[PDB]
């Protein structure tokens, strides 16, 4: 208990600074003290050496605050309980928790196993997803900036995020510099709430309540500081304390080999899917140019020429995003377009990972006999190639103002699916590319009207999934079934002939016995 009472210092101080607002109007009394304290904590964290080594600055800030507030000054019973207890909690830390909470941060009934293992593994996955939470901080930053209320030059901070997203030379330096620029933006935000207003690059919204007009920037710089705290805890956990082949034992190892590499050879597919959702949601000629370049970057075949266009993909993203935000300035569609740029940035990052029969060999074993692969592995590998025609048909249901062509297409496919696997993969991929092209025509065609987007997008999604299947040497042994089932049919026909001959000569003898009985 003494560790929990001697370590919980910085978060409780930030809680005092967060609940220490609204003791008067916009002055140096309540809010500006907490703003300067959060800015001092930001300078201590981003100065890369005062993460826990500015106890002189902490004690001197407590000393200056208590000295000015105690030698300077129903309404006089909570402010002395606010800042009086602020100085009292600073001195109570100086007597209890300024030595222990700052010295330990140096650099020199069986739920307990699930609790500790989940804590350590959630910390590890939270670091690997704290790169992704720098991305999610960009996400919530824009989703509060351009989707709820415009912050203090929100275009500038979201633009810092915007060129921070695709570039790894920016990311470690520009992450801390973005925390510093968001802290300076919060300083300029709380310095803009003055009372001399005398009542397009400022947007002074005249913040009334003096608490709500900072939380979209205070929580933003605080999320960047939570990322900085995760980086510091990453350094601390580094100083202290599935395989691509071992997935074939159970479904949890499949989930481990999935979660480690969920975007690895899946990425550009989900990129195109998010592009499809963006084109569906945006409804603009900007989305028409977006879909023109997206379908053009689909129009070449492999994962190699498009891999050369993928730095050019990041190039048109960086050419598009800032101009789009400033042109809307002087949307939520732009927020999900930034999410699309985030997925494309992730792909542009991890494309060239050259660090790292065969697995095709246990697969004809793995079409009937597995621990738990086959129940899902060939339900994927066989019982989706028909289900795609079901979702083609329901896309032709809802609304088919012209969807009859893909009804006739799934008619041809529904007749020809037994033998289209029996084609070789060249013509298979030819006809699949033809089919996905004739799909992605119609979405941009339904963008040229100035509903029914989701079923076409889901059809497209399953089409990318089967394209991954139809390349794969994992699928070749499911395809090897079809040569056998094409060959052995006449033997089964002769088996039905022999079985019904057995039935007829089973019934003739019964009738002979009954006629003998009657005679």
Per the structure block, which two tokens stand in for 264?
């690895």
Cα–Cα distance for residue pair 170/160, rounded to 1 Å: 10
Cα–Cα distance for residue pair 359/252, rounded to 1 Å: 19
Cα–Cα distance for residue pair 171/174, rounded to 1 Å: 5
Measure Cα distances from 116 to 111, 112, 113, 234, 494 in Å.
Answer: 9, 6, 5, 17, 64
Cα–Cα distance for residue pair 443/287, rounded to 1 Å: 11
Cα–Cα distance for residue pair 291/283, rounded to 1 Å: 11
* Resolution value, angstrom units: 4.0
Decide if 164 contacts 174 (C-beta within 8 A): yes
Per the structure block, which two tokens stand in for 192?
């803009």
Which run of H or E residues covers position 503? helix 489-518
Task: Give the chain's radius of gyration (CA, Å).
Answer: 32
Cα–Cα distance for residue pair 224/226, rounded to 1 Å: 5
Nearest to 295 by CA among 426, 458, 407, 460: 460
β-pair partners for 471 = none
Cα–Cα distance for residue pair 376/370, rounded to 1 Å: 10
Q: How far is CA 147 from the centre of its chain?
A: 18
Write the burial class of residue 136 (CB in 10 Å: 0-12 exposed, 13-18 middle, 19+ buried): middle
Cα–Cα distance for residue pair 251/244, rounded to 1 Å: 14
CA torsion, ordered 451, 457, 458, 461, to nearest 10 deg: 180
Write the burial class of residue 82 (CB in 10 Å: 0-12 exposed, 13-18 middle, 19+ buried): middle
Q: Which residues lie closer than 8 Å to 515 by C-beta, 6 or more apart?
A: none
Decide if 274 contacts 339 (C-beta within 8 A): yes
Cα–Cα distance for residue pair 480/473, rounded to 1 Å: 11
Cα–Cα distance for residue pair 505/370, rounded to 1 Å: 42
Per the structure block, which two tokens stand in for 400?
């088919």
Experimental method: cryo-EM
Give the number of C-alpha atoms closer than 13 A to the C-alpha of residue 257, restricted to the C-beta side: 13
Per the structure block, which two tokens stand in for 13?
């101080």
Q: Which residues lie closer than 8 Å to 405 by C-beta, 6 or more apart?
A: 438
Taking phi over 0 as left and psi of -120 to 50 as alpha, with beta for the rest, 24 belongs to left
Placement of tokens 């732009």 in the chain: 334
β-pair partners for 250 = 248
Give the number of C-alpha atoms closer than 13 A to the C-alpha of residue 283, restricted to the C-beta side: 6
Three-class SS of residue 210? coil
Q: How far is CA 97 from the centre of its chain?
A: 38
Three-class SS of residue 248? strand
Decide if 181 contacts 220 (C-beta within 8 A): no
Decide if 185 contacts 222 (C-beta within 8 A): no
Measure Cα distances from 513 to 29, 505, 507, 519 in Å.
Answer: 112, 13, 10, 10
Decide if 432 contacts 467 (C-beta within 8 A): yes
Decide if 164 contacts 138 (C-beta within 8 A): yes
Placement of tokens 């989703």 in the chain: 143
Kindly give the residue spans of alpha helices, DSSP state H, lying in 47-98. Answer: 55-72, 83-92
Cα–Cα distance for residue pair 189/218, rounded to 1 Å: 10
């Amino acid at each position: 208990v003494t560790g929990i009472y001697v370590k919980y210092w910085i978060y409780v101080c930030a809680g005092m600074f967060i609940v220490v607002s609204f003791a008067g109007r916009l002055v140096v009394y309540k809010i500006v003290y907490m703003f300067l304290f959060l800015l001092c904590l930001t300078l201590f964290q981003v100065y890369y050496t005062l993460w826990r080594k500015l106890l002189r600055v902490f004690w001197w800030l407590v000393v200056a605050y208590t000295m000015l507030v105690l030698i300077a000054v129903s309404e006089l019973f909570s402010s002395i309980l606010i800042p009086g207890f602020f100085l009292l909690a600073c001195i109570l830390q100086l007597h209890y928790f300024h030595r222990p909470f700052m010295q330990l941060t140096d650099l020199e009934l069986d739920l307990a196993a699930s609790f500790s293992a989940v804590l350590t593994r959630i910390q590890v996955f939270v670091r690997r997803l704290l790169e992704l939470h720098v991305f999610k901080l960009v996400a919530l930053y824009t989703v509060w900036v351009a989707l709820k209320e415009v912050s203090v030059m929100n275009l500038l901070l979201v633009v810092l995020w915007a060129f921070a997203l695709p570039y790894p030379r920016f990311r470690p330096m520009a992450s801390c510099l973005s925390t510093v620029w968001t802290c300076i933006i919060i300083v300029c935000k709380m310095l803009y709430q003055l009372k001399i207003v005398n009542p397009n690059w400022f947007g002074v919204r005249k913040g009334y309540p003096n608490l709500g007009y900072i939380q979209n920037h205070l929580q933003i710089l605080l999320l960047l500081v939570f990322e900085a705290v995760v980086y510091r805890r990453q350094e601390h956990y580094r100083r202290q304390h599935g395989t691509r082949q071992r997935l074939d034992q159970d479904l949890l190892s499949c989930l481990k080999y999935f979660i480690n590499f969920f975007f690895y050879k899946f990425g550009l597919e989900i990129c195109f899917l998010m592009a499809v959702n963006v084109i569906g949601q945006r409804m603009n000629f900007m989305v028409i140019l977006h879909g023109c370049w997206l379908v053009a970057i689909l129009t070449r075949r492999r994962r190699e020429a498009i891999a050369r266009l993928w730095p050019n993909y990041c190039l048109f993203l960086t050419l598009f995003l800032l101009y789009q935000y400033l042109l809307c300035l002087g949307s939520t569609n732009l927020i999900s377009d930034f999410l699309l740029l985030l997925c494309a940035s992730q792909q542009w990052q991890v494309f060239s990972a050259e660090r790292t029969r065969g697995e095709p060999n246990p697969i004809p074993n793995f079409i009937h006999c597995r621990s738990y692969l086959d129940m899902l592995k060939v339900a994927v590998f066989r019982y989706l190639f028909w289900l795609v025609l079901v979702v083609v048909f329901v896309a032709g249901a809802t609304i088919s103002i012209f969807g009859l062509g893909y009804l006739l297409a799934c008619f041809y496919l529904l007749l020809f699916g037994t033998t289209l696997l029996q084609k070789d993969t060249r013509a298979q991929l030819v006809l699949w590319d033809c089919l996905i092209l004739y799909n992605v025509t119609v979405i941009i065609s339904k963008n040229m009207l100035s509903a029914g987007i989701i079923w076409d997008s889901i059809c497209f999604f399953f089409l990318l999934l089967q394209r991954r299947i139809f390349l794969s040497h994992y699928f070749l042994h499911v395809s090897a079934d079809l040569k056998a089932t094409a060959l052995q049919a006449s033997r089964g026909f002769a088996l039905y002939n022999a079985a019904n001959l057995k039935s007829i000569n089973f019934h003739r003898q019964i009738e002979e016995k009954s006629l003998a009985q009657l005679k």
